[PDB]
Amino acid sequence: PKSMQCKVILLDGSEYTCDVEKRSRGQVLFDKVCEHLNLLEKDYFGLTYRDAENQKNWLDPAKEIKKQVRSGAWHFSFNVKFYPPDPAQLSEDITRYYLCLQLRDDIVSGRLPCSFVTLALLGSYTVQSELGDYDPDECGSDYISEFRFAPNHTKELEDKVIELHKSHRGMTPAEAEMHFLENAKKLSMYGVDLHHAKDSEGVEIMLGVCASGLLIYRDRLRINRFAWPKVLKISYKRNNFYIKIRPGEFEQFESTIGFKLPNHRAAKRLWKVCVEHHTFFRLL
Ligand SMILES: CC(C)Nc1cccnc1
């Protein structure tokens, strides 16, 4: 039996290495990673890889790894796939912990935009979780944390993190992580997967996929939202992505909204994340 080496970037930035038989399906590698992480609530998570166009793709657990990575390295990242709308209802603290690590990267990366005060507040809960109670011994008037809190750091942000950290004395790691999540879950881009597209007129838009449904970001003024129950059919053909929008009470016909994606693979990728979100969030 021939085995391929797999490298997985974990959410703390460390690398997990293992071997799987070369015809293994994605579920095999994912089960190895989740066992390493002591993770039981695995349904919210997945592995991504980069394709030959350098696009992030979800590794499909049902399909052979080799038929997905194709010509690329067997290099993966461990990620949140389905962001829980109510992290308080997850059964395990360790689930909440990995969700916090993902969100910290969503924030530092700029995928999850955040006000100054919310960057500082989230930062303060991370520090409380990671270091425990505030200690002035480690932190003088010139303190800069090793923790990344934002896409751009300022001394004012570091100071506000410390001020709010002082307020969390006695807070345990699980408690700080729950506070982090109660705040992060409210952010307008929480758990929103953005795809670049053009509308039927050629105007550049972003399509957001999340728990609540499909979002169309046009220009600051005019954001369309289609709740999953309002979506009967998701389709792709060539470079085009289509959603079937329910008639609404006393209308005779379903209505159709069409988008142009950069290429056929981008349209298929958007279709698959929409179908997976619709299934997941129709059962939640
Ligand atoms: C399917 C996910 C992992 N990758 C992605 C998300 C948004 C836009 N393009 C690619």
UniProtKB/Swiss-Prot annotation:
GO terms for molecular function: actin binding; cytoskeletal protein-membrane anchor activity; structural constituent of cytoskeleton. It is found in: Cytoplasm, Cytoskeleton; Cell junction; Cell membrane; Cytoplasm. Residues 4-284 form the FERM domain. Expressed at high levels in brain, with lower levels in kidney, intestine, and testis. Detected in lung. GO terms for biological process: actomyosin structure organization; apoptotic process; cortical actin cytoskeleton organization; cortical cytoskeleton organization; myelin maintenance; neuron projection morphogenesis; paranodal junction assembly; protein localization to juxtaparanode region of axon. Coiled coil: none annotated. Keywords: Acetylation, Actin-binding, Apoptosis, Cell junction, Cell membrane, Cytoplasm, Cytoskeleton, Membrane, Phosphoprotein, Tumor suppressor. Tumor suppressor that inhibits cell proliferation and promotes apoptosis. Modulates the activity of protein arginine N-methyltransferases, including PRMT3 and PRMT5. This is Band 4.1-like protein 3. It comes from Homo sapiens.
